Design a protein around this ligand. Structure first.
Ligand SMILES: Nc1ncnc2c1ncn2[C@@H]1O[C@H](COP(=O)(O)OP(=O)(O)O)[C@@H](O)[C@H]1O
Ligand SMILES: Nc1ncnc2c1ncn2[C@@H]1O[C@H](COP(=O)(O)OP(=O)(O)O)[C@@H](O)[C@H]1O
Ligand SMILES: Cc1cn([C@H]2CC[C@@H](COP(=O)(O)O)O2)c(=O)[nH]c1=O
Ligand SMILES: Cc1cn([C@H]2CC[C@@H](COP(=O)(O)O)O2)c(=O)[nH]c1=O
Ligand SMILES: [Mg+2]
Ligand SMILES: [Mg+2]
Ligand SMILES: [Mg+2]
Lengths: 209, 209
């Protein structure tokens, strides 16, 4: 009985990392086998180049860095497929949707070109999009010092996310991330339990194909 | 007056490297400004990962490595465009066509998926394909010890190259690489002089778009 592939995506300070950690903890306390993953996975050779870029310690050509972000997901595909086939549910903090939205926010990058490197990846069984209003996010502290952490760029990324959500091939679920950590967690947890039951019924899909 | 972008592609031991070096030398001796490039460009961070993979010193997931090879070309795009705009002709030993043919030779890799990361690269003004028969290549020594250096895989790559040559958007020229080094060089040199004259007349194109 395979595990489910659950992805969390969402606006800045929406709570992707907090909610991914709390979801894995709750699923395991409820008897599931679940594990956390994140992208970028900064531990690999590729992930180190990506972390340096995001920290502004290095500059990388925009197409090259887009392809590195995708390559960073493909290097984990053998692990992802092994874990799911062994019955482990994977909760993933960011995936291909962030890859497309962030590069797609830059000038002269079509959504089509951005998606192609990730075509074929393991298709999530559930994509949670944590929605939040700029005013409510502002109360979660200040902007980071990493690349892309500015209002005008986040807004362009958000528009790209909305284009991606028009894709009905995917099981998108909107989450009101403005509530408390615990309330948001309960909404995500219940959606996740339903997805896990259902993932055991259809084979793992392929993204965007 | 921009320089031309000339790519050499071709079967193993066809003479891509020898002919790229001899072409740059001859063009410069004839008063042109010309410089040599090669892919993979093993000197960058990405190129080191690719060289290690080809040497079998490391294993890389097939999609990830395909994307690294493309990222390795995009990191050189700013340099390529600057040089061409300054009137320097660039002679390139392998380009996106090798990227597609080699990954396309593997199982379950469509030509379409393989091409996408390189869509948009600087479009060559001339693509020379150095053709050679297995018998004639065998006389050029033995196979290398790098990945992909075996008959069955080279044959699959060759079929992919033939699919790519059906693309009429590109200025493909077949070269009979079975002749002497000097005879093959003269054929390439004359084709290259004609391309250089003509490249000053139309803007640099975009590959596969
Ligand atoms: N529902 C929430 N309400 C208030 N603050 C929150 C909420 N979720 C997360 N936070 C806080 O906001 C900050 C960003 O949360 P984080 O989970 O790191 O978001 P993301 O990974 O989406 O950037 C952290 O300080 C976190 O504790
Ligand atoms: N026309 C030719 N005839 C005979 N040997 C050749 C010819 N062109 C190259 N060679 C030899 O074959 C080998 C492979 O040439 P090389 O230029 O490195 O090919 P490639 O880069 O296509 O693998 C080298 O030893 C080279 O000297
Ligand atoms: C997964 C991914 C992410 N990004 C950006 C957005 C946020 C930042 C990671 O920041 P966080 O570590 O705070 O999640 O990196 C991309 O540009 N492309 C990708 O493929
Ligand atoms: C440019 C390129 C090349 N290759 C393979 C073919 C040959 C080898 C380089 O060998 P040579 O150094 O001997 O040219 O690497 C790919 O798989 N993808 C690419 O994008
Ligand atoms: Mg986070
Ligand atoms: Mg060579
Ligand atoms: Mg397409």
């Amino acid at each position: 009985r395979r595990g489910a592939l659950i992805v969390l995506e969402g606006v800045d300070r929406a709570g992707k990392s907090t909610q991914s950690r709390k979801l894995v903890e709750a699923l395991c306390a409820a008897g599931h086998r679940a594990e956390l993953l994140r992208f970028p996975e900064r531990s690999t050779e590729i992930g180190k180049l990506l972390s340096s870029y995001l920290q502004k310690k290095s500059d990388v050509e925009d197409h090259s860095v887009h392809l590195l972000f995708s390559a960073n997901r493909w290097e984990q595909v053998p692990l992802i497929k092994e874990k799911l086939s062994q019955g482990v549910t994977l909760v993933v903090d960011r995936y291909a949707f962030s890859g497309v939205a962030f590069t797609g926010a830059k000038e002269n990058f079509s959504l089509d070109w951005c998606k192609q490197p990730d075509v074929g990846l393991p298709k999530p069984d559930l994509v949670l999009f944590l929605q939040l209003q700029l005013a409510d996010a502002a109360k979660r502290g200040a902007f980071g010092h990493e690349r892309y952490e500015n209002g005008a760029f986040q807004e362009r990324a958000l528009r790209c996310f909305h284009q991606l959500m028009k894709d009905t091939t995917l099981n998108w679920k909107m989450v009101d991330a403005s509530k408390s950590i615990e309330a948001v967690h309960e909404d995500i947890r219940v959606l996740s339990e339903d997805a896990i039951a259902t993932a055991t019924e259809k084979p793992l899909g392929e993204l965007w194909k």
